[PDB]
């Protein structure tokens, strides 16, 4: 109201306010050191309490943008370090923040963050909790200027629980390390989803995003009326449009408004919200975004009575094409939360193609009469892929399932770099382990979720250093045909086997003494290289070599004087294997 800075402080609480201010600043002045930022926070934090005490103290009435920009233009070395960015300081408000927004750098040349020894962390944690966690909150925000501030903070608090528990378990690493790895993965999937959404929204336009939302909102709020889902689609689209654009405050107000609109109408939306709706403003929309689907209305009819039988199908359709198609997505989606969102859209695109071609022909009813039959194939291709992958995944276990994917893809696209094949087969291996333990009912949404980030990462890496037109064809295809396209890739027939190279297949004892999450990578690395050198090798001829290599690794690691065995026995594979596939 009179003072936006005080209202934020009374609303957030000192701790949250302090952490969000650090992130906000870390995201713009990425080259300042941690101690400069702790300095700002405290100055901004003391200034805010001035305002909390009396909303009429000087400057307390300025807008957050104006205050944030002024502080920003205060940094003495702004020009020295940021060049162009400092010229933003010569502008008037609306333009000035827009100017700062553009000079934000997604790829700063900062050194990767090296996870210290569990022991050094716990000790740092115990001796200086605040600085330990704040320093790392800073290191993460400066490296991710677009990661939405409050979610970044929701991750920070989970890193805090992780340390507070594990750092007294005596067998610390067993506790902490798995928790940290589970966190990095989420952190990465969340970040990659955000970019995915923003890039899709511009690569494919507002309509395709609204169709995606209708589907998603309907599985999620199946008892809501189509008019309520549409109102929520409209708002969800401004939110994402404004959050993609990047301005943290406008993005935060849009999300809060939506959340408060959702909580003021729970009855009209979902019976699952009462818990998310009583939480602090800071956590509200995030919680809602995470909510479990509401139980569907039990007895619901076939969509047949409104989309194929009833006269006026072409009439209600012509009248407002998208609204009608939206209703069909709504009715279909809400009946199927077992479906992935993109499947739902495959069906919508199918019905749309069919009403078009048909409504403008002899007998509408007798052209489009057989539309629901076209859904069946579409609905099982992914269903089957899940029955087979989760079953293959139970015979072999995680790591061998990863290896089976490794051989599959390498053959489909041998041109891809080994590090990319290895990291992709590994992550796709992790998606099976996750999603597969799930019941048939929640499996497809699970894999869609994860596959799209994996596939976009693979595409990005590929975009820079393009190496296969086919990957490229699948990568610049409709967001809906992406996975079907990759699943369509067949063994590459034109590929000429790679020139053999001994170095690549030579091993040493270091690997008897290397860690699991590191031994596997070299094994997986050589496996790929193996396939690339003898693509025609068969399931049996490969297993024979893989079994030899495992008896070759064991002999030179077990009951032996080691080292010399590896070059001796080693050359007795590179040539024995080389002829059992020659
Ligand atoms: C995210 C907020 C944490 C506060 C910063 C200090 C405490 C956090 C604990 C640090 C984790 C130590 C292990 C480690 O550093 O691994 C990952 C590093 O490569 C940095 O990346 P992550 O922090 O895993 O990912 C950033 C979190 N994201 C993905 C949500 C941005
Ligand atoms: C006011 C709010 C109301 C919401 C109603 C909007 C819903 C209408 C949806 C029509 C949906 C038909 C299904 C479908 O067409 O989805 C297509 C998208 O997934 C598009 O992916 P892209 O290749 O980027 O889009 C360009 C090509 N499309 C959009 C024509 C398929
Ligand atoms: C010495 C004078 C210095 C003046 C500096 C003070 C003004 C600068 C203020 C910068 C604004 C960034 C920090 C802040 O005040 O809050 C911004 C974020 O916390 C907004 O997030 P919230 O509104 O908590 O949204 C979280 C809930 N949502 C996401 C569902 C909306
Ligand atoms: C997890 C990301 C995709 C899931 C689909 C988003 C549909 C979720 C619907 C929540 C319905 C109410 C939305 C809400 O009230 O939140 C406003 C939002 O911005 C919530 O964000 P979402 O689009 O759910 O995604 C969270 C942000 N991410 C996903 C881009 C990281
Ligand atoms: C470089 C390597 C090449 C890449 C190969 C991509 C192939 C991955 C196919 C993965 C199969 C194992 C995962 C699984 O459990 O499958 C689930 C799917 O088959 C079903 O997902 P869908 O509903 O089709 O998800 C939508 C597909 N989109 C969103 C990616 C277009
Ligand atoms: C053309 C020239 C041929 C040269 C021969 C090199 C071929 C080797 C390349 C890949 C090797 C096979 C990769 C693989 O499948 O990993 C083997 C693992 O499944 C098991 O191997 P080991 O570590 O010996 O067994 C222990 C299993 N662990 C992991 C539980 C310890």
Q: Is 195 exposed, middle or buried (CB count within 10 Å of its CB: 0-12, 13-18, 19+)?
A: middle
SS (H, E, C) 215-235: HHHHHHCCCCCHHHHHHHHHH
Q: Report the C-alpha gap between 503 and 172 in whole angstroms.
A: 39
**Residue in 46, 57, 47, 41 with CA at minimum distance from that of residue 2:** 57
* Span from the CA of 307 to the centroid of ligand 5 (angstroms): 30
Q: What span, in angstroms and rounded, lies between the C-alpha atoms of 432 and 396?
A: 12
* 152 and 83 inside one domain: no
- CA 573, CA 507: separation in Å to the nearest integer? 11
Distances, alpha carbon 304 to alpha carbons 300, 369, 370, 371, in Å:
11, 10, 11, 10
Residues 6+ apart with CB under 8 A from 549: 523, 526, 573, 577
- Which string of DSSP letters, residue by residue, matches 71-113? HHTT-TTHHHHHTHHHHGGGS-HHHHHHHHHHT--SS--PPP-
Q: Which ligand is nearest to the CA of 46?
A: 3
For residues 467 and 481, membership in a common domain is answered with yes
Rounded to 5 degrees, what are φ and ψ at 533? Answer: -80, -35
Helices (H) and strands (E) in the chain, counts: 30, 0
How many Å is the Cα radius of gyration of the chain?
Answer: 28
Residue ranges of alpha helices (H) inside 277-320 are 281-290, 304-307, 313-319
**Which domain covers residue 255, as residue numbers?**
203-294
Query: Looking at the domain assignment, is residue 430 inside a domain?
Result: yes
> What Å resolution does this PDB entry report?
2.4
Secondary structure, 3-state, 114-172: CCCCHHHHHHHHHHCHHHHHHHHHHHHHHHCCCCCHHHHHHHHHHHHHHHHHHCCCCCH
> In the PDB record, what is the listed experimental method?
X-ray
> Which residue's CA is minimally distant from atom 30 of ligand 2?
208
CB 247 within 8 Å of CB 101:
yes
**Eight-state DSSP code of residue 241:** H
Name which residue sits closest to atom 5 of ligand 2, judged by CA. Answer: 326
| Spacing of C-alpha 275 from chain mean position | 25
Rounded to whole angstroms, the Cα distance separating 6 from 25 reads 18
Ligand nearest to the CA of 270: 4
Interatomic CA distance for residues 427 and 444, integer angstroms: 17
Q: Is the dihedral of CA 477, 482, 488, 494 positive or negative?
A: positive
Sign for the CA dihedral angle at 99, 105, 110, 113 comes to positive
Q: Which two tokens stand for residue 232?
A: 């929520």
- Distance from the CA of 254 to the center of ligand 1, in angstroms? 27
State in Å: Cα 353 to ligand 2 middle. 12
Q: Note whether 252 and 308 are same-domain residues.
A: no
265 closest CA partner among 290, 288, 240, 292: 288
Give me the phi and psi of 335, to 5 degrees please: -90, -20
Do the beta carbons of residue 131 and residue 146 sit within 8 Å?
no
Tokens of 304: 């047949």
Same domain, 158 and 216: no
| Residue nearest to ligand 5 atom 2, measured at CA | 409
Q: Is the Cβ atom of 67 under 6 angstroms away from ligand 4?
A: no
Instruction: Give the Cα separation of 115 and 126 in Å (integer).
Output: 17
Tokens of 17: 């306010």
Q: Which residues are annotated as a binding site for Ca(2+)?
A: 4, 11, 242, 247, 250, 253, 257
Report how far residue 525's alpha carbon sits from residue 503's, in angstroms, rounded to the nearest whole number: 13
**Which residue has the least CA distance to atom 27 on ligand 1?**
187
What is the C-alpha to C-alpha distance for residues 45 and 420, in angstroms, rounded to an integer? 46
Q: What is the 3-state secondary structure (H, E, C) of 174-186?
A: HHHHHHHHHHHHH
Rounded (10°) angle between helices 118-127 and 172-203: 90
Same domain, yes or no: 326 and 245: no
- Whether 550 maps to a domain, the answer reads yes
| Residues 185, 232 contacting (CB under 8 angstroms) | no
3-class DSSP state of 413: coil
Chosen domain end from 294, 311, 338: 294
Q: Is 300 exposed, middle or buried (0-12, 13-18, 19+ CB in 10 A)?
A: exposed
Question: Residue 36: inside a domain, yes or no?
Answer: yes
Q: Are residues 403 and 471 in the same domain?
A: yes
303: which 2 tokens?
């969509």
DSSP states along 291-303? PPPPPP-S----T
Instruction: With CA atoms as reference, report the closest residue to 12 among 282, 276, 254, 255.
Output: 282
User: How many Cβ atoms from other residues are within 10 Å of residue 500's Cβ?
Assistant: 12
Q: How many CA atoms lie within 13 A of 563 on its CB side?
A: 1
518: enclosing H helix or E strand: helix 516-533
Count Cβ atoms within 10 A of the Cβ of residue 432 and give its class: 0-12 exposed, 13-18 middle, 19 or more buried.
Answer: buried
How many other CB atoms sit within 10 Å of the CB of residue 382? 20
* Cβ atoms of residues 285 and 256 within 8 Å: yes
The string of DSSP codes covering 296-359 is P-S----THHHHTSSTTHHHHHHHTHHHHHHHHHHHHHHH-TTS-HHHHHHHHHHHHHHHHHHH
Dig out the tokens for 211 from the structure.
Answer: 């169709």
Residues 126, 167 contacting (CB under 8 angstroms): yes
Residue tagged 């070395």 (tokens): 77
Structural domains in the chain (count) = 6
Whether 578 maps to a domain, the answer reads no
Distance CA 220, CA 295 (A): 9
Ligand number with the minimum distance to the CA of 10? 3
Give one DSSP letter per residue of 420-467, joined into a string.
Answer: HHHHHHHHHHHHHHHHHHS-TTTHHHHHHHHHHHHHHHHHHHHHHS--
Q: How far apart are CA 161 and CA 186, in angstroms?
A: 16
The answer for residues whose C-beta is within 8 angstroms of residue 167's C-beta and 6 or more apart is 121, 122, 125, 126, 176
Residue where a domain stops, chosen among 446, 472, 492: 492
CB atoms within 10 A of CB 511: 15
Does 274 map to a domain?
A: yes
User: Other CB atoms closer than 10 Å to residue 346's CB: what's the count?
Assistant: 20
- Report the 10 Å Cβ neighbour count for 67: 19
* Shared domain check, 252 and 229: yes
Q: What CA–CA distance (Å, rounded) separates 504 from 502? A: 5
Q: What is the CATH number of the domain that holds 144?
A: 1.10.246.10
Rounded to the nearest angstrom, the gap between the alpha carbon of residue 276 and the centroid of all alpha carbons in its chain is 23
50 and 95 both lie in a single domain: yes
Q: Is 471 exposed, middle or buried (0-12, 13-18, 19+ CB in 10 A)?
A: buried
**Token couple for 390:** 């989760």
Q: Are the C-beta atoms of 444 and 338 separated by less than 8 Å?
A: yes
Query: Could you say which of 492, 514, 542 is where a domain stops?
Result: 492
122 with 169, same domain?
yes
Residues 29 and 55 both lie in one domain: yes
Please count the other Cβ atoms lying within 10 Å of the Cβ belonging to residue 557: 15
Same domain, 388 and 486: yes
- Write phi, then psi, for 515 (nearest 5 degrees): -70, 160
Residue 61 lies in a domain: yes
Residue 349's contacts (CB-CB under 8 Å, 6 or more residues apart) are 480
Cβ–Cβ < 8 Å for 321, 349? no
Are 15 and 160 in contact by the 8 Å Cβ rule? The answer is no
Tokens read off for 364? 């509408």
DSSP category for residue 511: G
Residues with CB under 6 A from ligand 6: 403, 505, 523, 526-527, 530, 533, 545-546, 549-550, 553-554, 573-574, 577-578
Q: How many CA atoms lie within 13 A of 421 on its CB side?
A: 29
Determine contact, residues 308/293, Cβ cutoff 8 Å: no
Within-domain flag for 580: no
* Residue at token pair 């409504």: 359
99 half-sphere exposure, CB direction, 13 A CA radius: 19
Please check whether residue 144 lies inside any domain of the structure: yes
- If residue 389 lies in a helix (H) or strand (E), which one and from where to where? helix 372-395
**Of 128, 75, 329, 341, residue with least CA distance to 216:** 341
Both 97 and 158 in a single domain?
no
Burial of 540 (0-12, 13-18, 19+ CB in 10 A): exposed
What is the C-alpha separation between 161 and 175, in angstroms, rounded?
Answer: 12
The distance of Cα 359 from the centroid of its chain, to the nearest Å, equals 40
Residue 193 · residue 149 · CB < 8 Å: no
């Amino acid at each position: 109201h009179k003072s936006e800075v005080a209202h934020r402080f009374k609303d957030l609480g000192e701790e949250n306010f302090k952490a969000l201010v650090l992130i906000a600043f870390a995201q713009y002045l990425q080259q300042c050191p941690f101690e400069d930022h702790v300095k700002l926070v405290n100055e901004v934090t003391e200034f805010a309490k001035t305002c909390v005490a009396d909303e009429s103290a000087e400057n307390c009435d300025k807008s957050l943008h104006t205050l944030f920009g002024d502080k920003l233009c205060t940094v003495a070395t702004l020009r020295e370090t940021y060049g162009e960015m400092a010229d933003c300081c010569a502008k008037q408000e609306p333009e000035r923040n827009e100017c700062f927004l553009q000079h934000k750098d997604d790829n700063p040349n900062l050194p990767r963050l090296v996870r210290p020894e569990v022991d050094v962390m716990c000790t740092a944690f115990h001796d200086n909790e605040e600085t330990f966690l704040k320093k790392y909150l800073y290191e993460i925000a400066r490296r991710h200027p677009y990661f939405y501030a409050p979610e970044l903070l929701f991750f920070a608090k989970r890193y805090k629980a992780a340390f507070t528990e594990c750092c007294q378990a005596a067998d610390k690493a067993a506790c902490l390390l798995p928790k940290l790895d589970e966190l990095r993965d989420e952190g990465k999937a969340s970040s990659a989803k955000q970019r995915l959404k923003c890039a899709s929204l511009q690569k494919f336009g507002e309509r395709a995003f609204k169709a995606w939302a209708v589907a998603r909102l309907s599985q999620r709020f199946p008892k809501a009326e189509f008019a309520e889902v549409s109102k929520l689609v409209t708002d969800l689209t401004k939110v994402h449009t404004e959050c993609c654009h990047g301005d943290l405050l406008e993005c935060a107000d849009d999300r809060a408004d939506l959340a408060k609109y959702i909580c003021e109408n729970q009855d009209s939306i979902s019976s699952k919200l009462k818990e998310c709706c009583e939480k602090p403003l800071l956590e509200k929309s995030h919680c809602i975004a995470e909510v479990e689907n509401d139980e569907m209305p039990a007895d619901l009819p076939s969509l047949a009575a409104d989309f194929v039988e009833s006269k006026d199908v072409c009439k209600n359709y012509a009248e407002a094409k998208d609204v009608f198609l939206g209703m069909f997505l709504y009715e279909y989606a809400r009946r199927h939360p077992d479906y992935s969102v993109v499947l739902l859209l495959r069906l919508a695109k199918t019905y749309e193609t069919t009403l078009e071609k048909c409504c403008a022909a002899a007998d509408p009813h007798e052209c489009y009469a057989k539309v629901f039959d076209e859904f069946k194939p579409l609905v099982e291709e992914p269903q089957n892929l899940i029955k087979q992958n989760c079953e293959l995944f139970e015979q072999l276990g995680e790591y061998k399932f990863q290896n089976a994917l490794l051989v599959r893809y390498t053959k489909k696209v041998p041109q891809v770099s080994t590090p990319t094949l290895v990291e992709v087969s590994r992550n796709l291996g992790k998606v099976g382990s996750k999603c597969c333990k799930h019941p048939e009912a929640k499996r497809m949404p699970c894999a869609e979720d994860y596959l799209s980030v994996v596939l976009n990462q693979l595409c990005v890496l590929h975009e820079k250093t393009p190496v296969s037109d086919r990957v490229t064809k699948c990568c610049t295809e409709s967001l809906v045909n992406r996975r079907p396209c990759f699943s369509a890739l067949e063994v590459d027939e034109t590929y000429v086997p790679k020139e053999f190279n001994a170095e690549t297949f030579t091993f040493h004892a270091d690997i008897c003494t290397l860690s699991e999450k590191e031994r596997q990578i070299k094994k997986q690395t050589a496996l790929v290289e193996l396939v690339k050198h003898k693509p025609k090798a068969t399931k049996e001829q490969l297993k024979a070599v893989m079994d030899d290599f495992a008896a070759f690794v064991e002999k030179c690691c077990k009951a032996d004087d080691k080292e010399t065995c590896f070059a001796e026995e080693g050359k007795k594979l590179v040539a024995a294997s080389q002829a059992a596939l020659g």
